[PDB]
Design a protein around this motif. Structure first.
Motif, PDB file in Angstrom:
ATOM      1  N   UNK B 171       0.821  -1.208   0.000  1.00 51.45           N
ATOM      2  CA  UNK B 171       0.000   0.000   0.000  1.00 51.45           C
ATOM      3  C   UNK B 171       0.857   1.262   0.000  1.00 51.45           C
ATOM      4  N   UNK B 172       1.945   1.271   0.777  1.00 51.05           N
ATOM      5  CA  UNK B 172       2.818   2.442   0.816  1.00 51.05           C
ATOM      6  C   UNK B 172       3.556   2.631  -0.503  1.00 51.05           C
ATOM      7  N   UNK B 173       3.954   1.533  -1.148  1.00 53.70           N
ATOM      8  CA  UNK B 173       4.586   1.634  -2.460  1.00 53.70           C
ATOM      9  C   UNK B 173       3.629   2.270  -3.461  1.00 53.70           C
ATOM     10  N   UNK B 174       2.345   1.914  -3.390  1.00 56.40           N
ATOM     11  CA  UNK B 174       1.368   2.508  -4.296  1.00 56.40           C
ATOM     12  C   UNK B 174       1.142   3.977  -3.959  1.00 56.40           C
ATOM     13  N   UNK B 175       1.061   4.309  -2.667  1.00 55.20           N
ATOM     14  CA  UNK B 175       0.906   5.705  -2.266  1.00 55.20           C
ATOM     15  C   UNK B 175       2.054   6.558  -2.790  1.00 55.20           C
ATOM     16  N   UNK B 176       3.289   6.084  -2.612  1.00 53.45           N
ATOM     17  CA  UNK B 176       4.448   6.893  -2.965  1.00 53.45           C
ATOM     18  C   UNK B 176       4.569   7.093  -4.471  1.00 53.45           C
ATOM     19  N   UNK B 177       4.138   6.115  -5.268  1.00 51.71           N
ATOM     20  CA  UNK B 177       4.216   6.263  -6.716  1.00 51.71           C
ATOM     21  C   UNK B 177       3.039   7.053  -7.281  1.00 51.71           C
ATOM     22  N   UNK B 178       1.855   6.931  -6.677  1.00 52.93           N
ATOM     23  CA  UNK B 178       0.693   7.656  -7.182  1.00 52.93           C
ATOM     24  C   UNK B 178       0.789   9.143  -6.867  1.00 52.93           C
ATOM     25  N   UNK B 179       1.333   9.486  -5.698  1.00 47.50           N
ATOM     26  CA  UNK B 179       1.434  10.890  -5.318  1.00 47.50           C
ATOM     27  C   UNK B 179       2.484  11.625  -6.143  1.00 47.50           C
ATOM     28  N   UNK B 180       3.512  10.917  -6.614  1.00 47.15           N
ATOM     29  CA  UNK B 180       4.627  11.531  -7.326  1.00 47.15           C
ATOM     30  C   UNK B 180       4.629  11.204  -8.817  1.00 47.15           C
ATOM     31  N   UNK B 181       3.506  10.722  -9.349  1.00 45.73           N
ATOM     32  CA  UNK B 181       3.366  10.430 -10.777  1.00 45.73           C
ATOM     33  C   UNK B 181       4.453   9.475 -11.274  1.00 45.73           C
ATOM     34  N   UNK B 182       4.798   8.485 -10.447  1.00 35.98           N
ATOM     35  CA  UNK B 182       5.658   7.400 -10.863  1.00 35.98           C
ATOM     36  C   UNK B 182       7.133   7.573 -10.574  1.00 35.98           C
ATOM     37  N   UNK B 183       7.562   8.740 -10.101  1.00 34.85           N
ATOM     38  CA  UNK B 183       8.973   9.014  -9.833  1.00 34.85           C
ATOM     39  C   UNK B 183       9.068   9.553  -8.410  1.00 34.85           C
ATOM     40  N   UNK B 184       9.423   8.690  -7.462  1.00 34.75           N
ATOM     41  CA  UNK B 184       9.544   9.121  -6.080  1.00 34.75           C
ATOM     42  C   UNK B 184      10.731  10.070  -5.921  1.00 34.75           C
ATOM     43  N   UNK B 185      10.640  11.033  -4.999  1.00 35.84           N
ATOM     44  CA  UNK B 185      11.771  11.947  -4.782  1.00 35.84           C
ATOM     45  C   UNK B 185      12.937  11.306  -4.047  1.00 35.84           C
ATOM     46  N   UNK B 186      12.702  10.243  -3.279  1.00 35.50           N
ATOM     47  CA  UNK B 186      13.771   9.547  -2.575  1.00 35.50           C
ATOM     48  C   UNK B 186      13.428   8.061  -2.497  1.00 35.50           C
ATOM     49  N   UNK B 187      14.267   7.318  -1.777  1.00 38.17           N
ATOM     50  CA  UNK B 187      14.106   5.881  -1.586  1.00 38.17           C
ATOM     51  C   UNK B 187      13.532   5.669  -0.189  1.00 38.17           C
ATOM     52  N   UNK B 188      12.237   5.389  -0.113  1.00 34.70           N
ATOM     53  CA  UNK B 188      11.591   5.164   1.169  1.00 34.70           C
ATOM     54  C   UNK B 188      11.917   3.761   1.687  1.00 34.70           C
TER      55      UNK B 188
END
Ligand SMILES: *[C@@H]1O[C@H](CO)[C@@H](O[C@@H]2O[C@H](CO)[C@@H](O[C@@H]3O[C@H](CO)[C@@H](O)[C@H](O[C@H]4O[C@H](CO)[C@@H](O)[C@H](O)[C@@H]4O)[C@@H]3O)[C@H](O)[C@H]2NC(C)=O)[C@H](O)[C@H]1NC(C)=O
Ligand SMILES: *[C@@H]1O[C@H](CO)[C@@H](O[C@@H]2O[C@H](CO)[C@@H](O[C@@H]3O[C@H](CO)[C@@H](O)[C@H](O[C@H]4O[C@H](CO)[C@@H](O)[C@H](O)[C@@H]4O)[C@@H]3O)[C@H](O)[C@H]2NC(C)=O)[C@H](O)[C@H]1NC(C)=O
Ligand SMILES: *[C@@H]1O[C@H](CO)[C@@H](O[C@@H]2O[C@H](CO)[C@@H](O[C@@H]3O[C@H](CO)[C@@H](O)[C@H](O[C@H]4O[C@H](CO)[C@@H](O)[C@H](O)[C@@H]4O)[C@@H]3O)[C@H](O)[C@H]2NC(C)=O)[C@H](O)[C@H]1NC(C)=O
Ligand SMILES: *[C@@H]1O[C@H](CO)[C@@H](O[C@@H]2O[C@H](CO)[C@@H](O)[C@H](O)[C@H]2NC(C)=O)[C@H](O)[C@H]1NC(C)=O
Ligand SMILES: *[C@@H]1O[C@H](CO)[C@@H](O[C@@H]2O[C@H](CO)[C@@H](O)[C@H](O)[C@H]2NC(C)=O)[C@H](O)[C@H]1NC(C)=O
Ligand SMILES: *[C@@H]1O[C@H](CO)[C@@H](O[C@@H]2O[C@H](CO)[C@@H](O)[C@H](O)[C@H]2NC(C)=O)[C@H](O)[C@H]1NC(C)=O
Ligand SMILES: *[C@@H]1O[C@H](CO)[C@@H](O)[C@H](O)[C@H]1NC(C)=O
Ligand SMILES: *[C@@H]1O[C@H](CO)[C@@H](O)[C@H](O)[C@H]1NC(C)=O
Ligand SMILES: *[C@@H]1O[C@H](CO)[C@@H](O)[C@H](O)[C@H]1NC(C)=O
Lengths: 442, 442, 442
Positions: B171-188
């Protein structure tokens, strides 16, 4: 609020703002007690409690590869990034004192019999010390008793769900420090709860009115502070939170907006643009200019500024809003030989620089397009219109209330002969533009 | 650390820093197995398991409206944003190879019998492949058996709580990619756990000392990397993590700070400011200048720099710290006819430009205000003071330890006649300022 | 995509991009119903339900110290930060209308019998209103019945776990607004679920193709919007979400990249650099120039730009890519007397400015170092190479597909006599450089 449109320079000045100036940092040191979790083991296979215990031990171990210190003229350009760098330098400097083993034991000693204590560090700096013990207390008083000889798949699910509730804060603290290499960008609700933030602000070394404003608007204190990891000492996670001290409030501030002032004769243009835009606030007998955007921020009539972000300017710098052509102050401008059409939104309106090549209009949310604008610099009141457009680009005006005034004057750009206008200038004193024309003609 | 105050230019140079240069990117491809969750249904009304199942299916479906590629001279200004844009270009370029259906099946084939495998892509690039299967294993081996014919309101709450533990990462992986349009700003910590980050760094194509420094300081590797969504392939979420390879360490670095050097005669000012401030690091026989703030970052004596952010400068550029007036190198400066009072903090002190119109002092955290400063450019040691102030603006000095040295010299600005000083200059070679004076007088 | 290398200016232009322009804002107002939680009390000591109830009441109370309004020429530099400030002004202006007590009751009235309704505010603006009632319904229908006279340590753990599932969204909404002082930086999954985002986009005042693109790429809508807290009204949390309306799609866009063009004679250099780099998009008969990086963003052939970030430029500005030396348009350049070696990556290749003092090469991911580059400005195709290096600094080329073309021409910098080249210029019209040489010689 009172906004003046300065016709002689295609600019506005809006007065009546009240300062909220960050003048210092209050340091709140935390000891988050985790408890004896290393000496707990689950050997009866997969379990809910084992999953929560494995998360907790993995987060505690991960925290040891995180370290915040040692390894494990263009006025705007001069001030850019200063406050942000100053904040980190200040925080790292005091973290250097707190990271000493002797300083940590002294902090733990002050917290033996209470959850909060005022303490002075070896460098004479006074800080607030706060203990967070629920997870340690749950581990000692409740969890360890239930794991009699390493059997964690117990029929008590209340214990497993209690564990996941009690370790949530510690896990988030580890996440926030590991992702940001020990220096969080802000103060999260896991670094500092609402009650702890209210307690720390109340202990700040400032006056009552400042503390009352900070208490009633503590989400802004949250946003302007940050946290630094100190380290793991036994079963205690130790970090510090830098809280902004808004030590000066309700002194006069004002903001200057500007747009290109272009005058044309026979198809040629002479243009200038004021380069003293931004926030100005007074404090203790001086005026500070905040040239960069991220450095000040409004909440109604109040403007929150970081003092480390500003440049102390002479009082005479305000004459750029009065007699910009004749003043003895070196009013900063840029120049161009070709017009730029754009919109500079103001607190109570908008500056519209509308020149040849584009079409500009003002609109209403109820009525639609009101009227096309004439070429030149126009001042639109947010009572006159809801939107201003350059071609199809919409600029939504604010609905802030206040009195507008037009200070009439021939645009300084109209005095220029475009055939004799100098090369493009960037952030030069306005009298140096005149000096360039006068010297080049002699 | 060794800091030199350069009196002839109101600047400092601090030497003794050790480089940590990002020289490459290591790509870690992940396949997060979700399992057969579409073919699960809860028809017996509201349930804990139904809530967890609805969250999981909604997150899996949301992931298909996310896409990272196809739809579903002023030295500082020249280098600004280059490294950040270069990082995205590099990551998107290799994601283009990984996004191919054939490349995905090859990745899944390498991961059939193990959770980690080194793989080479069709473009000859070597990556690490990692499988994450707990959620799929829980869905297949445990959850699906408990839902015998669509009844999810079962008396086993351990199953519902286990489900919420096992799906948290997905779920967190989906949150982090959906909020950032597929490119996360860092490595969570959900893109890459501590163990996976330690495994990926150990596989990097660099030497042992580099890997040891990266392993022991892997929170910085986390902070400098990012993640790109590749897509959903069956029940597997596929993403890639770009990990920074710090392939060069412990080569000499140094930082240059500067403040306005102003000289006045008969009420008129000639001012200059060094425009070569920032970090310099050596590598493989050349010197790289990092002019922008966000591009380098210290952790003690080590400075982490992105090489894609720098400009290769000639070795002779260091003479700006030696013989700035007489050197043949075009040392970059800006100029002004009016002084700016400000503070430039140094690693081991502070440069204080204190000119007419402001008051400056140095303070102690124990003793208070020590002394008022004289007008001109002053160098304050962090052994002399804890704070420096311009009027009421406080600048907290660092507590970094090291030797300070004053390199005496008449300020270059003192050689100027203010009556003959040129128009304000921005980032010009210093000999062009002299050329302007000499030409205008001839 | 079609990329042209412009040999006369060491620059590229890449055409064939399709616009996705943010032209408006759609406002979605939310009422998150919490329910009667103040009148619930747990007096039987520590409990799972008490912990969830204490979190919920603490989050509701914390929300009242959060407020978003009232307290509780260098083209790139002119446009920098405009769109971001314009977005906040627009959002705060409509939040001023929504924050009125009468406007809130009207919103609640429209939502009495349904979870979604189109509503018009007192200022004639049309918004979407959305109700979120699960937490209130759980509190009213389920939780309050189970707490018969303040006993919360009930044997039903399903109730405690249900509570923690139902309050998760409200707690995250409070976290996101408290940390950001009432103005979230983006639209999280707790401000707006996937279904609600799909419902709001479908209601936008634009055409079908625009809505289809936004629906199929709604993670970008998420990334470009933000949320503003309105306040707490009874047991309802009221906030608004500003959703970007991409009202213009698939009109021509193109990007201009550039690198220093340096020519040397007898050891002296004349250098220029195009200062019109960035994105250009057409709309409704005009061309808009987007000079700053964060303002446009590609997803394949589509480029997402905020229209409030651009400057309307004349159609003739494209001749800088055609006849930059002879054109009547004032093509913007900077100048230098000394070369800068660097790499400017292009969509389909790379511009390599390789001058005396550095070594440059191109590499392959399969074959290694291909070839050393000659001194001067070189254009590398991403079919020719995978990487370009200046000394040891690696620049990874994109793998975007498209046709490259070289538009031959003698570099304009070759026409300059370095002995007569002017002082360093920043963002000046190119004909002003020639005017400086011609005037200084007369
Ligand atoms: C640009 O505009 C600014 C602001 O308007 C202006 O600064 C002002 O200049 C006036 C000039 O008179 C100042 O007023 C003077 O103040 C001094 C004390 O500091 C008084 O001694 C002067 O009094 C004399 O003149 C009076 C009549 O004007 C007589 O009644 C009296 O007997 C004296 O003869 C006089 O009041 C004023 O203080 C400043 N204001 C500020 C805030 O600086 C500046 O001069 C303008 N620059 C230009 C156009 O060159
Ligand atoms: C600004 O300062 C810099 C650094 O101080 C300075 O660069 C230095 O110039 C000196 C000039 O001598 C260089 O030293 C020379 O190096 C060459 C080899 O490269 C030697 O052949 C020279 O030896 C001669 O002179 C010696 C005595 O000085 C004799 O013993 C010998 O027999 C030769 O006659 C000489 O050592 C030095 O290498 C550089 N340093 C660097 C790092 O570049 C620069 O010249 C200054 N610029 C000014 C003020 O114009
Ligand atoms: C820099 O390059 C640009 C683009 O190449 C260039 O702009 C172009 O100039 C030409 C000059 O002819 C324009 O073409 C003219 O268009 C007008 C209508 O607008 C016509 O009337 C002209 O026709 C005459 O000439 C024709 C032969 O060339 C004859 O067949 C006819 O009978 C007429 O005598 C002519 O076609 C062209 O439209 C523009 N293009 C654009 C897009 O602006 C510019 O002039 C160049 N600047 C320099 C080098 O000074
Ligand atoms: C952890 O254990 C302590 C000690 O048994 C619990 O505290 C007791 O709670 C009972 C009620 O169940 C009270 O009557 C006692 O007075 C309490 N004793 C003390 C010393 O506080 C505590 O409730 C347990 N925690 C959890 C989460 O179950
Ligand atoms: C999912 O089901 C598997 C299979 O029943 C469980 O694994 C077994 O656990 C028991 C102990 O309860 C062991 O004695 C068996 O050897 C295990 N078998 C295998 C094949 O691993 C597993 O515990 C279940 N998972 C959960 C979370 O309940
Ligand atoms: C909250 O209480 C309501 C009312 O009892 C529950 O809804 C009922 O659920 C049963 C099944 O257990 C159905 O047969 C009824 O038709 C439902 N009634 C209504 C009015 O919806 C609901 O399940 C409870 N919620 C939770 C989370 O337990
Ligand atoms: C674990 O047990 C040992 C031996 O009793 C003790 O010395 C150690 O301090 C314990 N660990 C913690 C974290 O208390
Ligand atoms: C669901 O069942 C069908 C039919 O048995 C099967 O083809 C499909 O692959 C299943 N879905 C998943 C995600 O395995
Ligand atoms: C709590 O009870 C009082 C009295 O019955 C009522 O007036 C009040 O509205 C209740 N609180 C809420 C949040 O409904």
């Amino acid at each position: 609020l009172k906004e003046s449109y300065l016709e002689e320079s295609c600019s506005t000045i809006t007065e009546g703002y009240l300062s909220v100036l960050r003048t210092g940092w209050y340091t709140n040191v935390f000891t988050l007690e985790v408890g004896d979790v290393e000496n707990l083991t689950c050997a009866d296979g997969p379990s809910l409690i084992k999953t929560e215990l494995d998360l907790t031990k993995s987060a505690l171990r991960e925290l040891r590869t995180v370290s915040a210190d040692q390894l494990a003229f263009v006025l705007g350009a001069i001030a850019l990034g200063v406050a942000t760098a100053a904040a980190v330098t200040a925080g790292v400097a005091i973290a250097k004192t707190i990271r000493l083993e002797s300083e940590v034991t002294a902090i733990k000693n002050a917290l033996k019999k209470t959850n909060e204590a005022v303490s002075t560090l070896g460098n004479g700096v006074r800080v607030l010390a706060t203990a967070v013990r629920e997870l340690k207390d749950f581990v000692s008083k409740n969890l360890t008793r239930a794991i009699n000889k390493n059997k964690c798949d117990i029929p008590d699910l209340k214990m497993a769900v209690s564990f996941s509730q009690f370790n949530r804060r510690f896990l988030n603290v580890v996440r926030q420090f590991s992702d940001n290499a020990g220096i969080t960008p802000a103060i999260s609700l896991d670094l500092m709860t609402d009650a702890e933030l209210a307690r720390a602000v109340s202990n700040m070394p400032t006056s009552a009115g400042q503390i009352k404003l900070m208490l009633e608007n503590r989400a802004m204190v949250r946003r302007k502070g940050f946290g630094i990891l100190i380290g793991v000492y036994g079963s205690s996670v130790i970090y510090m939170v830098q809280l902004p001290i808004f030590g000066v409030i309700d002194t006069p501030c004002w903001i200057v907006k500007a747009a290109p002032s272009c005058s044309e004769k026979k198809g040629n243009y002479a243009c200038l643009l004021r380069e003293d835009q931004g926030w100005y606030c007074q404090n203790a007998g001086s005026t500070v200019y905040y040239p960069n955007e991220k450095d000040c921020e409004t909440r109604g009539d109040h403007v929150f500024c970081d003092t480390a972000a500003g440049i102390n300017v002479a009082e005479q710098s305000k004459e750029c809003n009065i007699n910009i052509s004749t003043t003895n102050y070196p009013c900063k401008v840029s120049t161009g030989r070709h017009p730029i059409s754009m919109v500079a939104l103001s607190p109570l309106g908008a500056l519209v620089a509308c020149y040849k090549g584009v079409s500009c209009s003002i609109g209403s949310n109820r009525v639609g397009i009101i009227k096309q604008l004439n070429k030149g610099c126009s001042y639109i009141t947010n009572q006159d219109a809801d939107t201003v457009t350059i071609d199809n680009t919409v600029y939504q005006l604010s609905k802030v209330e206040g009195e507008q005034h037009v200070i009439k004057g021939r645009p300084v750009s109209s005095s220029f002969d475009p055939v004799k206008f100098p090369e493009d200038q960037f952030n030069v004193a306005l009298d140096q533009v005149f000096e360039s024309i006068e010297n080049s003609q002699a």
